[PDB]
RNA sequence: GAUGUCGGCUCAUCACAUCCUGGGGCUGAAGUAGGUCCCAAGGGUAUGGCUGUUCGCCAUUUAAAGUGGUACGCGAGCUGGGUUUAGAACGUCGUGAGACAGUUCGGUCCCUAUCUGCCGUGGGCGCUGGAGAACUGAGGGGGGCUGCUCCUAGUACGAGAGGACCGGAGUGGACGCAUCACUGGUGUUCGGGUUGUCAUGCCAAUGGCACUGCCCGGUAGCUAAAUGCGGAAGAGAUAAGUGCUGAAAGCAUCUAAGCACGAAACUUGCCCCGAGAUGAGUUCUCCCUGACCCUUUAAGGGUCCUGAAGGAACGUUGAAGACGACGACGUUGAUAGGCCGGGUGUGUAAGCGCAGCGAUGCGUUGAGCUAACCGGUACUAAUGAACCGUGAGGCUUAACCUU
RNA sequence: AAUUCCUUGUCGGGUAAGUUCCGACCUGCACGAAUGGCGUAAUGAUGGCCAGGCUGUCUCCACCCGAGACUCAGUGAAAUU
RNA sequence: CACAGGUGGUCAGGUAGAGAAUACCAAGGCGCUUGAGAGAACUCGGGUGAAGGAACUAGGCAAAAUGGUGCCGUAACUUC
RNA sequence: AGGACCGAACCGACUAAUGUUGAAAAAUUAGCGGAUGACUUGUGGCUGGGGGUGAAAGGCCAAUCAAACCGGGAGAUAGCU
RNA sequence: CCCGGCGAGGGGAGUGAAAAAGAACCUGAAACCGUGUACGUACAAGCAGUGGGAGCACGCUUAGGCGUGUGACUGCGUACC
């Protein structure tokens, strides 16, 4: 089964009747407008293109716009695709929304990664900053030696050094749906969603056995 | 650090070539004057959508 | 406690003044405690008619934290100082028969059955 | 969307009394516990302005007995039974600190008068 | 990082920002028309417009008020007496910034600040 | 036959039996069997790029009229 | 014409002869537990003291307190305590000067990274006409740890006390990720409190400056000390090991023909980067169907007409970030400052009425002032253009096109 | 011990400690009476040890600001080879 | 070197304060010439810190803390 | 009164931070001591290299000191590179 | 006579045998940095050289297998003192 493209929109500590509160993250589920349903008519290729949203979209390219034109005709925010199973989809007005999360106990959450500027040396990997007393030579913070010696004469691959985030994906994995709320159309998750607020996300039914 | 040998002249040219000054993508002149322009800024005599700038 | 060592306050009649955490329990490769954590304390003071003497090593549990301690809404009851009620060195429950000063409403658990079973309030 | 910062005003309760710092109050609450209902009340002085959307709370300092405690009781909590304003003093501050340790004539602060 | 912010810190400490902005906001109210750096012109725009707002109807209690935020005798005279009735007919956008071009002494990017209702000006140059 | 490599990570050699390599992604047993039969750098890359195996029994090469060869 | 040291910190890496869980044989092992014992480098692998300390002792955690190597890893990262090591001086010894691998006191540790690696990142090209959008998996990594008790399970077994593993489960700990509502932190684009002199002609009032003068609170952001949470059922290929069937040896026998089972490792399953995969990518969405002269010719040279879709500069600027790239977008306009409604801070401006000699408080007024957030508003500023991109786009076999 | 091959003496004591510190004792390195010895008030920017203060040195690091780095314009080295 | 290095004599203003400490300041001196923008690592300087209180290290390493004037009150040792 | 004391100006530099291809011939900023004394110190004067001069470090002698600078011996000599 | 900072520098017109002798003036290498042309560089790899060589410009190739300069690719291959 597919995913739901959300918006990170809301964070609430909400109360329950016994006087206990749950920190929660609040996602407005918008309905899917399907585009065409790409299927294995042509090649072996099988996937569904969906737009959950709209933009003011006065500068957009004709090649984005004709996807929205064959679609729910709403000058779209963007194109998200999902592989599919168990036969082709119906191509117009499907509107999968809150009904998906009525039986989903825990969801994965597949972000648009996390957008934290530089990250870099010491902060991203949570290392120590070298002693800030003892009059250390040009050093109140240093990461520590990254290889050994001539005996190998290299730096091994995958070592934690410098660099930016590069905005990949981020799966938080397995956080509980606390509630799903029809008519307001809000999905309350118990854990956190990747990125700052006003960013997009995938909130999808869990991937793992 | 320091260095091993005096380096080749092709090396010096590669290191400064990408840092070299980049194109203006042609230029502008005004819709509204016999004054020449600077693109998406206002001239010394204030012509773009009038008013005034640089009373120097 | 949060750093290695750390004195925080006696809160029962087993000792006097301050007592020192030497370690945290309930895991290892730890430096700092959570709110609900069980500490290993040494008595740095004692009182001669208390339950224990200077250099005794015992177990203990948190009864105040100056940052505050929390659970139900995430709301702290936030105190003027850190404090710890000493337990027995292997067989659990307090050794002291009295609590002195306020309490939390986080304290309703099996491990404080000496002091919350008294009659004035909060059983 | 358009919900952000509106949601602090939507959640926020309307039956909340008008205030300035040094107002005393009383909070009646449950003890909550694992399976059992008991009650209790709390009095003292409220040291600081609240109004915090959903998590908004009466922040009493007790100073009744023993060593000093601040207690935060949530306005928006379903177990909170009653909230009286009582006496209304002036302080002109976000914090009260010199009364932390004094509990003698400390939870009965005066009306402010002419 | 700096996500979900606005505005700018320029070139030095807060005592410097207050004293530079006090130099420049006093120069604007006498001359109507200035040229400065682009980042700097916005922050100058943002300091003076709300003062203009306060002074939009003539009023002694708001003149006592204005003297308390800005205890300067030039800024409070130009407000209320000359500039209240000038801007009485506007609700925001009391001044505009013009993106003027590059600086000749080095290359620095600039913007000009010009009162909204400033409207007779020469189009010749001076030396 | 366990196809030895050390691409850059983790204490140990890492490995795969010939059987995993033929049953799943089957090309590679024959691929790294001819690899070591070609010389050094430049000539050995130039000899290799003429070959294809694909996955197995899924070839697209009907239209050229391939000349059969038995080994 | 030099690889420059101990102990310690930081940061690691590789060998398994595994600290441990996990699978399993033997046992003078009843069962449990231990002894004996093979597989296995995947993952986690504690902390304060004294000493210059490798090594020592002690207090404590942990289910647990490992083994080996790295110019005695690592000063083109960090120390100047140690000894020789300049002085002093103890202890010792020699006519002495002066020594000691015994010793105490503080005492100069250098280099802006050329080429090389590593991780992040841009530009340029092949992608087969072009452009833009989504995207598949050749190929390589993350995770892989582990206490607790509940069930499993007081049961086989044993005289009786007692007495196990996988799977499920709630919960702790490490480790790794994301996060800012909660709780703390800060917040030189906000309020208030406060010492002082200087200033508005004076007073009431208020303010420049003294570390952002000090001190406390603080929106939005960011953040861990706070928050959520993976660590997986299964699959295949097995190892050690139990075998069946079966030869040396009419049987027996993990083996040789044959074939059931058999662990976290290994190939994965869950997660992430990925078409330079020249084998050059697919699929989706959009777009361009004027012309002549010649040679070098799956081509290039010249010229008129003439360039769409798209691109970038430029510009305000962002919920994106060293620089970029990425992104909203230039009146087709909410991009951003004001401004209007609202959030959330703070604590009722000054003036006026009034008590009081006043400091000051109190009604007027629940005051005033307010930053980043949200939604509006063209009020305001982003002149319009030009330019790069062009007229339907390979050879050759098979297939189809009147072929 | 400013001194001790062994040893971080031994024992008592503070303590998470205890080679260091402080008292006694000698199973005494190579201590030992002007390269002098025992002991002391005041003194030292002089040395070791103790309990409390306080504090971002640290547990464990977060956010803010400025000059370089980084952006643009100017000028423009060096160790080395 | 218009080098934050070094260097003798005299004269002697204000408010608050205990004075030539010390905040500001009259007269005067004078902006120690890259600038403007961002606000990455990191380098140096400056702010602030929950809870702890050197647990960092061979070693408390400024940075933090103590301090000033009036008063009450006051130890072993001592050459009083 | 004082080879007493807390302490500016006035002198130094035990430590800490920094500077470490410096703003400075160890200076700077901050803790620190001396500042009626065996102090601070202007002006003028004097000894000349294994020679002076030293309340002691084999200290200091034109940015410096376990041997200052220059003209001659001198192409010192090298069982040597 | 032209541009210009009241400037620098060069060209235009005129001198001379000669300024391809223009005043730092004799004729003028090599390092040095820059202009100008041909050909090459995105199956891409270490003494940068050697051995084989498509291609391409130029010489009318004297068209008679050639000269010149360069060169995809690729066997071989470790400096001098």
From Swiss-Prot, chain C:
Reported impact of residue 97 to A: Reduced RsfS binding
GO cellular component: cytoplasm; cytosol; cytosolic large ribosomal subunit
Matches recorded under SUPFAM superfamilies: Ribosomal protein L14
Single annotated GO MF: large ribosomal subunit rRNA binding
Record flagged with keyword GTP-binding: no
Pfam families, A to Z: Ribosomal_L14 (PF00238)
GO biological process, one term: cytoplasmic translation
Keywords: Ribonucleoprotein, Ribosomal protein, RNA-binding, rRNA-binding
Highest taxon listed in the record's lineage: Bacteria
Database matches in PANTHER family: 50S/60S RIBOSOMAL PROTEIN L14/L23, LARGE RIBOSOMAL SUBUNIT PROTEIN UL14M
Family according to the record: Belongs to the universal ribosomal protein uL14 family.
Main function: Binds to 23S rRNA. Forms part of two intersubunit bridges in the 70S ribosome. In the 3.5 A resolved structures L14 and L19 interact and together make contact with the 16S rRNA in bridges B5 and B8.
Assembly: Part of the 50S ribosomal subunit. Forms a cluster with proteins L3 and L19. Forms two bridges to the 30S subunit in the 70S ribosome, contacting the 16S rRNA. In pre-50S ribosomal subunits interacts with RsfS, which may inhibit association with the 30S subunit.
HAMAP family the UniProt entry points to: Ribosomal_uL14
Protein name in the entry: Large ribosomal subunit protein uL14
Name of the gene encoding the protein in the UniProt record: rplN
UniProtKB/Swiss-Prot annotation, chain D:
InterPro entries: Ribosomal_bL19 (IPR001857), Ribosomal_bL19_CS (IPR018257), Ribosomal_bL19_sf (IPR038657), Translation_prot_SH3-like_sf (IPR008991)
A GO molecular function held by the record: large ribosomal subunit rRNA binding
Signals that turn on the gene: Part of the rpsP-rimM-trmD-rplS operon.
Record key words, sorted: Ribonucleoprotein, Ribosomal protein, RNA-binding, rRNA-binding
GO terms classed as biological process: cytoplasmic translation; ribosomal large subunit assembly
GO cellular component: cytoplasm; cytosol; cytosolic large ribosomal subunit
Assembly notes: Part of the 50S ribosomal subunit. Contacts L14. Forms two bridges to the 30S subunit in the 70S ribosome, contacting the 16S rRNA. In pre-50S ribosomal subunits interacts with RsfS, which may inhibit association with the 30S subunit.
Family matches, as HAMAP family: Ribosomal_bL19
Function of the protein: This protein is located at the 30S-50S ribosomal subunit interface and may play a role in the structure and function of the aminoacyl-tRNA binding site.
Protein family per UniProt: Belongs to the bacterial ribosomal protein bL19 family.
Protein name per the record: Large ribosomal subunit protein bL19
Native organism: Escherichia coli (strain K12)
Curated annotation (Swiss-Prot), chain E:
A single GO molecular function term of this UniProt record: structural constituent of ribosome
Entry-linked InterPro entries: Ribosomal_bL17, Ribosomal_bL17_CS, Ribosomal_bL17_sf
Protein's job: Requires L15 for assembly into the 50S subunit.
GO biological process terms held by the UniProt record: cytoplasmic translation; ribosomal large subunit assembly
Record text on subunit structure and interactions: Part of the 50S ribosomal subunit. Contacts protein L32.
Protein's UniProt keywords contain Ribonucleoprotein: yes
Name of protein: Large ribosomal subunit protein bL17
GO cellular component: cytoplasm; cytosol; cytosolic large ribosomal subunit
Keywords: Ribonucleoprotein, Ribosomal protein
Pfam families attached to this UniProt entry: Ribosomal_L17
Family assignment from sequence similarity: Belongs to the bacterial ribosomal protein bL17 family.
Ribosomal protein is among the record's keywords: yes
SUPFAM superfamilies: Prokaryotic ribosomal protein L17
NCBIfam families (alphabetical): L17
UniProtKB/Swiss-Prot annotation, chain F:
Keywords: Ribonucleoprotein, Ribosomal protein
Subunit structure: Part of the 50S ribosomal subunit.
Keyword Ribosomal protein on entry: yes
First and last residues shown, out of full length: 72 to 142 of 142
Functional summary from the UniProt entry: This protein is one of the early assembly proteins of the 50S ribosomal subunit, although it is not seen to bind rRNA by itself. It is important during the early stages of 50S assembly.
GO molecular function, one term: large ribosomal subunit rRNA binding
Gene coding for it: rplM
Protein name as annotated: Large ribosomal subunit protein uL13
GO biological process entries: cytoplasmic translation; negative regulation of translation
Source organism superkingdom: Bacteria
Entry's Gene Ontology cellular component terms: cytoplasm; cytosol; cytosolic large ribosomal subunit; ribosome
Family: Belongs to the universal ribosomal protein uL13 family.
